[PDB]
Design a binder for this molecule. Structure first.
Ligand SMILES: CC(C)(COP(=O)(O)OP(=O)(O)OC[C@H]1O[C@@H](n2cnc3c(N)ncnc32)[C@H](O)[C@@H]1OP(=O)(O)O)[C@@H](O)C(=O)NCCC(=O)NCCS
Ligand SMILES: Cc1cn([C@H]2C[C@H](O)[C@@H](COP(=O)(O)OP(=O)(O)O[C@H]3O[C@H](C)[C@H](O)[C@H](NC(=O)C[C@@H](C)O)[C@H]3O)O2)c(=O)[nH]c1=O
Ligand SMILES: [Mg+2]
Length: 187
């Protein structure tokens, strides 16, 4: 598979071993990591994590991206599709992090591109993910875009996002993905 994921102000490309330092730094930023998993601050350890990740990628099992801002081609975060299953065909996503240098609407664009990748580039039917209780704005984001709060445990709320909702969102959210082919005008 090869991806061509770009929106208005951001673009995504697959993680390489050389992104290890950017990743270590991002994930060990205490302003960003309140609700994600602890991980190594050691660059070589992170390079190793990516090498294993690359085997999974080679076998169609996982796709992990650096998020870039288009205007200066500088890295602003991460996102991942992982843990694929069947009946129905489902993917998880997460590892979703944006730093201070993010564009304003990067969160919207990157989420949309995830769903482009999963539902159209990879042919899944459903998306699953979770968000820690307390990560209030992220709950609100996902509910707004159309995720369905299935359920929960002591830590998380568990969501699914159906392919059907992604197809509505392509029209409603077209302004985030590219320049419009025609604009609405009221007389
Ligand atoms: C999760 C994360 C990537 C979200 O990015 P964010 O920039 O904080 O997301 P926001 O919800 O602020 O969305 C960005 C902007 O688009 C707007 N927006 C969000 N959803 C929208 C929608 N459906 N329609 C239109 N606008 C929308 C927001 O209001 C915000 O604009 P504002 O500047 O006017 O507030 C980021 O907060 C982060 O890295 N957090 C730490 C790591 C983490 O917890 N990851 C998630 C684990 S569950
Ligand atoms: C991606 C990555 C992970 N790790 C380590 C950290 C863990 O010990 C292990 C597995 O990581 P996880 O699967 O928990 O990845 P993580 O990026 O922390 O994110 C996941 O766990 C978090 C606690 C969050 O729940 C996260 N959820 C989301 O981001 C969902 C979005 C849609 O809001 C979810 O994807 O691997 C690394 O050491 N380096 C890495 O680059
Ligand atoms: Mg490409």
């Amino acid at each position: 598979v090869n991806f061509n994921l770009k929106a208005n102000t951001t673009y995504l490309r697959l993680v390489e071993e050389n992104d290890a330092e950017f990743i270590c730094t991002l994930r060990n930023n205490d302003k960003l990591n309140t609700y994600i998993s602890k991980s190594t601050g050691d660059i070589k350890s992170q390079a190793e994590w990516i090498r294993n990740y690359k085997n999974r990628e080679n076998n169609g099992e996982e796709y992990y991206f650096i998020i870039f801002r288009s205007d200066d081609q500088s890295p602003i975060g991460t996102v991942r599709l992982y843990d694929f299953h069947e009946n129905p065909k489902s993917f998880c996503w997460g590892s979703w992090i944006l730093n201070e240098h993010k564009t304003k609407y990067a969160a919207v664009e990157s989420a949309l591109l995830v769903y482009e990748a999963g539902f159209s580039t990879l042919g899944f039917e459903q998306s699953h993910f979770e968000v820690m209780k307390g990560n209030d704005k992220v709950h609100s984001f996902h509910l707004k875009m159309g995720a369905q709060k299935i359920s929960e445990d002591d830590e998380n709320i568990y969501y699914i996002f159906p392919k059907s909702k992604y197809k509505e969102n392509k029209i409603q959210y077209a302004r985030f993905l590219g320049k419009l082919e025609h604009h609405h005008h009221h007389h």
